[PDB]
Symmetry: C2
Subunit: 214 residues, 2 copies
Amino acid sequence: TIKGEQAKKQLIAAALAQFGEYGMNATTREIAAQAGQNIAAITYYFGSKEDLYLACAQWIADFIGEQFRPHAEEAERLFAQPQPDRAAIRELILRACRNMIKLLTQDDTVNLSKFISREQLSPTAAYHLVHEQVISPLHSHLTRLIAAWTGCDANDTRMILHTHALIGEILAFRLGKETILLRTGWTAFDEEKTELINQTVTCHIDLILQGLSQ
Amino acid sequence: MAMNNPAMTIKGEQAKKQLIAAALAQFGEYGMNATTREIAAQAGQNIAAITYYFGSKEDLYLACAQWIADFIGEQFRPHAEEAERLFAQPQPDRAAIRELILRACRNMIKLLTQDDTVNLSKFISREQLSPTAAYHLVHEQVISPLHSHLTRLIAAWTGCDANDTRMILHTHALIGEILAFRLGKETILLRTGWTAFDEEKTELINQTVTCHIDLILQGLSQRS
Ligand SMILES: [Cl-]
Ligand SMILES: [Cl-]
């Protein structure tokens, strides 16, 4: 039971790396070897390679959800006040963006990004599980905060597109990781360099918020 | 991974092009755990032809990278030529600089909402996160020159230093807006309710990204 939860945790971590690189042409053999387990553990603990692929998506959704939950709760508390400040709405936008930038310049989330990025261009049931549980709630959370600050309608197609483009700036330092490392000459991100990325994206958000403001 | 000498015959060149198209699809999806059997079947050629034309699966993988570099390079050669005609000007028209930035962005967005470039995007995205010799081929030949050309245009507009770490970061963040409708394709299709892009929807995307480019250009030129 507790022996099995450690085995399951190693299997998910190894599957995330192999699926992230190879999709469903990852092998149970290589997943099990990287996990320090026998190939039978995949069938025993998860049912099949296919079921382990979905458990990888579930793990990613749970991981993002635990990061996202406190931001949603803080926003609900702010909008419960009779007179929220526009400055406080902006601060929620920036705390969400800085938290995403931080996680997306961290080595140990790279396999999560690989797994999701593959599913963005070839979606399976895995993508829709993560989308419904957390990616859509996070996208809508940012769309509504931006609409709340600017005074626009969060459900307008244009607002959704505006927000999507902005999120692309946050994602560019992970999805364009090798491009920006070579172009800056940095061999790796560190705290000082993540702070520069924060300032860059914060600047663009402020400019776009001010331009959209009613 | 090594380069291959070019085919001596038209029929050879055509069969190699069929193999590269199929290999982009299979490598795009599966990386190096793609199979030559599935590549050959998708191409309508034989496994043995991969061996004769390319030598190995890994050499075919590098040929895919080279094809990507040539394709992007030809799409943005006219932009590069126009940028150099501007750069060599003593009195560069700020309006012309902006027009070149917006046209490059609109060309990128258009290509990145076409179905027939998805496999290219799959191939590069995996290489961004797990780079091999393939990424560095494409980077040196076209990605870095295009990235640098857009940075230099933004710097010219704003009056900043194109080699400044700041300008490189601003440019990279901006390019992420242009890539977002491909790299976040499924997210934005579901969030909008669209089942597919089309002319009209791509024009809406272009209007959105253009708006952002203008707001950022204006904001970065303050204090100049
Ligand atoms: Cl297998
Ligand atoms: Cl093979």
